[PDB]
């Protein structure tokens, strides 16, 4: 959901680091302006197309 920059074609990225957005570096911990980069889908049979 969050990356510093874009991706070159045919590329993969697996690194998981806390994406700092605020000016203060939060030293890789969860908190304000410091979100984990990997989100999660939620799948249930009752969803719509």
């Amino acid at each position: 959901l969050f990356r510093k920059s874009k991706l070159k074609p045919f590329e993969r990225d697996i690194s998981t680091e806390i994406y700092q957005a605020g000016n203060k570096p939060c030293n890789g911990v969860a908190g304000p302006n410091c979100y984990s980069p990997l989100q999660s889908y939620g799948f249930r049979p009752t969803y719509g197309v």
Binding site: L1, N33, Y35, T46, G48, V49
Partner: protein, 596 residues
Amino acid sequence: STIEEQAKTFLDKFNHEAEDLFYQSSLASWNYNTNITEENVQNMNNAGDKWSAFLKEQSTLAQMYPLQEIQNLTVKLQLQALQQNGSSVLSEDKSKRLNTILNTMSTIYSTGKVCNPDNPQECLLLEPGLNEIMANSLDYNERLWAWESWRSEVGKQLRPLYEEYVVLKNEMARANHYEDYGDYWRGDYEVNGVDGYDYSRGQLIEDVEHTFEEIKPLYEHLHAYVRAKLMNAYPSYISPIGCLPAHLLGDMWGRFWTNLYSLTVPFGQKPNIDVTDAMVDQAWDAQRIFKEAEKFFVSVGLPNMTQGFWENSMLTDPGNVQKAVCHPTAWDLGKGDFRILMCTKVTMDDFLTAHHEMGHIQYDMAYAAQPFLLRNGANEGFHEAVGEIMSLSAATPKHLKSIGLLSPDFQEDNETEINFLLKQALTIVGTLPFTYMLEKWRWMVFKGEIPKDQWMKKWWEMKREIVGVVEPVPHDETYCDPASLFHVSNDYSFIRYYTRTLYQFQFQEALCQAAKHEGPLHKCDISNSTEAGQKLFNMLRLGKSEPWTLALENVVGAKNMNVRPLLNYFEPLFTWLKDQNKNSFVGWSTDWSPYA
């Protein structure tokens, strides 16, 4: 970097969690509503607790972004809504006290019961018997006694609790920057930051008054005709110049005048329009009705329902052990799931209610692409107006003839149109003064200008002034008459039932203009038209992304609500009533009192 990017990041996260949490809570609520069991209640409680807690922490976290550094004006709305709708300011003891007070209000309204005099043997509740008695029974003494007894047994208990509740809500409003809780309600229509479209909170008040200045003659002529007709039913009790007794309006509070149609039919000899027998002959079931509604919706160009809607929604009462509430509702669980919850009988009223609810479902589907915090109508009134405009065209004789329920041999002349317009009038026009009166009284009491010891005193004084209805039994300050109203006890804004009505006749008159229709306004259809469909859809898809003044402009062409279409709708009825009221006095006298 700058505040804008950080706010955008925070919103991009918040939407993602909010979707899933809302889905879980709504699914739990639906599961309880279609399956009434204690564990379903527990699941509802858990899901609601999680949702409320999450909203609370998000409201706490959102405070770090000052709102004066946002110029996109789209992030600002989302930030404002999130900050407002989850912020608590009262102390813990006061907060739990208010929660207990509200729970007590709901419990006492649900559990209230009154029964026959000097006989504690058998007793009944408001919904089963009292409503039927006030809608059907013509006994003067029975209706008067029941009306007095319910108020005596409810408002007297509810008075001091309301006295504490108003104070607590007042300090809640004072803690924020609003002047009072009435201003907190009025802030819904507030519009700021846009040139040529700004709407101030106070202005609304003035506007309402101006509107009520123009609809007075129609209401008073209808009142005179109603008084003249009810003279026949109860000659001794009703005065030719006094206000009507409060216990002879066909319901508990006089909110609707529908029940008096049989007692006030203009031409009883002529047959009434009805299709119930026709549907019975053709062996109509629920799915046929809903498919007909869907075809009507398609015929204007709007897309029709998904497969999940047909599979998941339920339309017939399960019966047996499976018990569920049969109040018609349109659920939008989010994430692409829309359902309708209602129990269907083979009647014309259910046939119209199907269209009415499908309108809400289509409106919900319209703005699915907007962000989560902006998935709502432009104000509290647009949603109801959209859901109600279609029921008008659904019941027109032309649509019935095209569908085929009405025989082609049917004809139209004076009496049919007059009866239809009058039946519509006793439902639409009558409720406006009552709603305006209630809203104005609550505004005044929250303003604090009226002392407690005059609460009842003013309440009836304005009732004889505007509504033109006199109480049949005197009451002291012990009673709390407004507390007997369901919406007042449950803390619901009631002004939306006045802005909605004046909206809908603005919409219809617009669409019939685009449909190139000619003739009387009340005989209009938009089945084949498509320009009206796309024009409506253009406003429907907006959601909350724009000020409601702009949205109203994009459909009709005005920046404010107007009363002219409403009067234009009922103009033939106005002329006929003016003709009929030649020998009847117009205007009620406030000096008369039924109890000597």
